[PDB]
Amino acid sequence: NQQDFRTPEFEEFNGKPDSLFFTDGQRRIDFILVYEDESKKGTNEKQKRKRQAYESNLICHGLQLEATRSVSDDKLVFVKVHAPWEVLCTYAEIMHIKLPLKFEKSRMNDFYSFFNPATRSRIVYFILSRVKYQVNKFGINRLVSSGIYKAAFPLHDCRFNYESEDISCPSERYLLYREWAHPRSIYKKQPLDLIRKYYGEKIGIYFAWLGYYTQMLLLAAVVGVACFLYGYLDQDNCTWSKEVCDPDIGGQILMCPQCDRLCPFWRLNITCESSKKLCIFDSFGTLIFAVFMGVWVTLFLEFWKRRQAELEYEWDTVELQQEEQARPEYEAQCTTCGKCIRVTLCASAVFFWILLIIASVIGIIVYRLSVFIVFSTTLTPQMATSITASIISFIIIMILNTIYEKVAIMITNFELPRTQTDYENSLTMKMFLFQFVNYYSSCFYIAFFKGKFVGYPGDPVYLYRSEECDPGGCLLELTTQLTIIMGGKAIWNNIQEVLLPWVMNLIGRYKRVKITPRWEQDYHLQPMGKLGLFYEYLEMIIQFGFVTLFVASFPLAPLLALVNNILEIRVDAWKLTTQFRRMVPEKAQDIGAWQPIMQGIAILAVVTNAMIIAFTSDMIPRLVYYWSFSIPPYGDHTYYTMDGYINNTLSVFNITDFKNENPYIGLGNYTLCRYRDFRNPPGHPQEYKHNIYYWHVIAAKLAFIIVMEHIIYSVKFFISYAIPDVSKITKSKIKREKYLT
Amino acid sequence: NQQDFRTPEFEEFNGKPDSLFFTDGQRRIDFILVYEDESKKGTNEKQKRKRQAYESNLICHGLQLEATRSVSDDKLVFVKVHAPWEVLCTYAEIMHIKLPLKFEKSRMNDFYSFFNPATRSRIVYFILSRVKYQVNKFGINRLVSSGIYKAAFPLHDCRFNYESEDISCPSERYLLYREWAHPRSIYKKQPLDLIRKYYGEKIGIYFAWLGYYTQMLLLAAVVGVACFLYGYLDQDNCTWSKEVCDPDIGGQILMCPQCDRLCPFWRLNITCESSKKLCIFDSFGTLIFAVFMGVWVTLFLEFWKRRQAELEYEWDTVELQQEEQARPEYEAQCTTCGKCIRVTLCASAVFFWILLIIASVIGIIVYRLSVFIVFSTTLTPQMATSITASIISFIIIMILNTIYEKVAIMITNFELPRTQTDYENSLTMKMFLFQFVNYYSSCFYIAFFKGKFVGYPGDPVYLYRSEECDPGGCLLELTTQLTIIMGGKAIWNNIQEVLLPWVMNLIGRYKRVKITPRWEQDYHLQPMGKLGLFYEYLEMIIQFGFVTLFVASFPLAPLLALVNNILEIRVDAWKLTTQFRRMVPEKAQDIGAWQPIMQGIAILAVVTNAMIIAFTSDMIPRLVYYWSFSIPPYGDHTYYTMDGYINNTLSVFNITDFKNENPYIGLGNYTLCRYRDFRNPPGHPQEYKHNIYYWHVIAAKLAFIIVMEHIIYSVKFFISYAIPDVSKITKSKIKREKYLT
């Protein structure tokens, strides 16, 4: 309970380059602790006065220790930590570690190299986190947080590129870099048993979920490519876009300008080329695919629950939850009624920053309104404006993402969560709320609030002059924004994931921190951090959002995400194998709070896809025209047909601007221009009021939302009721375990 | 393992009228078995050849037995079953019965009259169901099913009216009849600990759920009486019903007749009186109350989850689930692939009977259409028709209810569920599906499909001549139908619950099956059955439906259900205390499949209330008139006002019937009559087509459904997220148990 004997068989050794064992070769290295002492203001001795109080207690609890001085830094001392078999047995009786039995699997010790190095490192981390050093001081994480211990980590097995010098050691890192974690192995399956055996259940459940997500994205992408190619093969039979591109019809439709000054009266032919690709993006193929994706997200979640029950059997992820260690920052600071008011102030700060990113979207709006004029002066101006605004908004999103990463850490540190699980849950909800709003607010704007409230040419909506949409619809602008944000997020995040740990290791080598042992090799690496795969999970969840919430705009979002996921498995595996220091293995039975987040996104996606097809697509006005306004009482044709749709949908405007400016008489010499709204013609008794066709179309839009939402929610309820959550073979395996034991 | 010694210390005793102990007075009666043998075709001896094979094994497993002949029937033999302390201890070590500890509560035996008579009867029923008699024959339920044993039951404590003759015995039935189960005690609280102590966890959880449901119905009824009285106090300020009742305005509106022959052109004044009470039933009070009830059902379900976690602590309902005994009818009959096709045939028969009750509703439609003419010949005819049709449809519902009780038993017996829990789950889903459709199909018809598809006077919808609705709306017809069905179901079911076990006991006394002991007194009672409180639960769930799905029609459904529940607690408790034989206590941690059923009804109720307010109420056309058609572009008034609504909503019809009959020229000499639809006037370019006001109103109806559904579902999601499922004091009690143990 005191500091008398430390660091036994302390000697400097450098003879073996690749040895996971001690200098004697009897016992292996379960952990490495790293400190320095030899080089003010009374801080040094005081840490020496505390650090030894830890280490001696480690041998009073049974652990074997042995240090060597570092060969590069004379201050750095590497302490190898090993657990004897008796200490392993008692601290594996405390935590019910499930071992093979004669492979039947049961509690604290079973009948049968017995303990893998992964579960050995888990045992020694439990021991390292429990032992008291001292007021009451709890564990090792407080020492590493307080600058006492520089680094504590388990060792990797070998070099990832070269086979280990030991003949008895299985080169787990090398064989996991050859058959995984390498772009040479992009086609091969994932050795999920091997990656959990090397890494742990958190890493194994992330890569199992990522491989399953990629497999289901392959199905969604095949059906989406089928629907997109159905639109591409019916591209030549679209009546409305051919009528747009015809100069005898679509050329004559002279449109009103959108902004007040320095915007010309434009003919509809400049829409024409975009209109062609627009016929692929709101056809019946994207509607059928939106209904299919409403079914597919439920198949995804139900078969993930089945795969997760399969892994809860196969991997023994359901372990008894020991009482969790409190975080050191909580117990250092140590009423509850005031902590509640601190939490409310924290929530108000979070909603302040959410409203800041809303103001950033308002700034993007004002940018588009200012830059459309100068793009019309200096590939139509609105399409060029939309592509460059997508580029600029993606850059602003990536800039504000890092700033919220930092301030989300600060915001979650200001409130004090006692446990790491409560910390991660609060950070998960807060960080996802910002990433949701930050990544999808521009897309939700272009979908639901862009062009909807503009009014007619006389009396437009002034905030100044909210953005008017294209005659085809803002679906093409949404598709371009989605493609830019999704593909650029994939490319930029993969480039950052490749470079940033690699660049940090490179600058460490250049700061010079020839033959060298395993602990120095692993110490010159990047640590993952207390978060872990948080961000990894976050990224994919964002991608899931982009796949599901916005799938009615373009059906190639599963294909884009599938290409990204096929790259992402390898880039995550490569960085975790080579560039990162080895994490202690943990145990996780699910992906965490991300699964409630995904079920919430699945519920929201039905509403969002119905509102996309109704409001930002132009499928419902086309459908209503064909079925109701080409018949005799409202139209001239005898049978249902789609010709004359563009001439009979756009509304005429005589140049009568209200005197509450009158810009059109300066911008042109024309007297009548057509705009995209369904208001009455001039000279009506109710001129420029909403007409019978508008109210018919908006009733069909709302009836479509109602019918599609209720039908899809009922089909999702029936599919979730029909598919059992646990698989039949997994029930049989659990029943066979209960039968034998 | 064989039949050698049976029925020890067998003697006829009649000296003690009220003795729960044996003739010696040492040991108590845990069970009573009842058989008869002494009075063909070889059946008698064969049952004698089997019955003894049971009883001897009972003493080979340790139970003590003692029979007396009955004093009334010389054939009847009553066998008293007692468990010794050692047998109680071993079979309470098999099933982890939780006893007080020094009241801390833990497993198989604890430190401390020790076993209550309830848990003693539960132990002896476990023993009675496990012991083999014999091919393999399992337990006692097979003997009672096969006519071997006439009756097996635990004894009640005393007479319910009179205190027990024993001085040591607590008169549990009498004290539970004095402070509960008696209309004298209608105001008092429920002794929930005492009723679980006497009866078991299934009965205690039903009465805890019923008392909690009554308490929450008190809150819902107070707010509903507030909203109804707000409508009753604003009854004199309704502009539209006053305009209906005014003979200068509402008298002049001469309406078209509904059916083809023998129905007169009627003025709107005959609606007038109904219109007054109609102003209480679609006001803003019922709208505010519908939003409040969408919140209240979620508060109900969340606080039931909190009360249920409170009872899972306080009552020890979470016991280890022993492997359930298979049902005797399954194991008697004993491939699985053919059993699947039997299940599909069973499902097809169920949907055949559901479509039969749909045809019964179609017959009710044809009845109304036939009887409105003769009610117009022989209190307007449509209101008299609606009240008598509610009476006749309620009688037909009560007639078809019993028929489906019988055929649902037959349908669930045709498929073969192996376990009683799977049997009850399948019967719960099938029986609720029929009770749902049977009780609410007439109400859903009057709400959503009555008067909606009728067409204009020219070209009406012929099936013949689907029913036309009233100018105020079919909400008053729905309110009358709901009040009749709900109040009559309450009154009739309470009268049946009072009489039917009481009448069966009375006819048993009259068939004569003076001083008599406890086992004969309890044998001359009605057994509850293998179902138990199934039907009780069913009834209340139906009531819940009537409270929540249809709450927008009338706000006094919580008050009607609250009066019914205050009566229902006492009538259920009274019949279970006095008229029914004592059930063995069981263990239930929740109400069962009824809680998924209630969550489904809660989800459906939001949709149903939104569609009631939009479609079968007339609030949205009134609101659209006030906000949009009394302004200058569509109306004459300068400010928003509701006068002229009745004259400007109903549509004119010149008598131009299509020649595809022309009944109106025979039924009257009038040339123009007004009907309830929003079609264009005659002489229009689009005459009798739907107009701008119709499409405006239907767009507001669908936008109201969308806004109300999404707002209420979001508020319900936020309330379910904010309210934690387990209570804070209950977390503290569970943590204190984990702290002490």
Ligand SMILES: CCCCCCCCCC(=O)OC[C@@H](COP(=O)(O)OCC[N+](C)(C)C)OC(=O)CCCCCCCCC
């Ligand atoms: C909760 C997750 C997603 C929420 C997104 C909300 C969507 C809001 C968009 C919206 O309602 O737009 C208002 C109009 C749209 O009619 P449009 O004809 O698109 O407006 C004119 C556009 N044009 C001049 C270019 C021809 O539509 C109406 O006037 C009918 C109002 C019904 C909207 C209710 C939806 C959600 C309420 C919670």
Ligand SMILES: CCCCCCCCCC(=O)OC[C@@H](COP(=O)(O)OCC[N+](C)(C)C)OC(=O)CCCCCCCCC
């Ligand atoms: C799932 C649980 C409950 C389901 C109940 C479904 C409700 C069906 C009722 C319905 O849609 O009615 C059709 C019309 C109603 O317009 P009204 O103006 O009431 O019809 C004329 C009536 N009048 C002659 C006396 C003036 O409305 C329309 O034409 C718009 C159609 C939108 C209906 C979609 C709702 C549910 C779809 C799954």
Ligand SMILES: [Ca+2]
């Ligand atoms: Ca990435």
Ligand SMILES: [Ca+2]
């Ligand atoms: Ca990643």
Ligand SMILES: [Ca+2]
């Ligand atoms: Ca499921």
Ligand SMILES: [Ca+2]
């Ligand atoms: Ca009743």
Ligand SMILES: [Ca+2]
């Ligand atoms: Ca009842």
Ligand SMILES: [Ca+2]
């Ligand atoms: Ca909750």
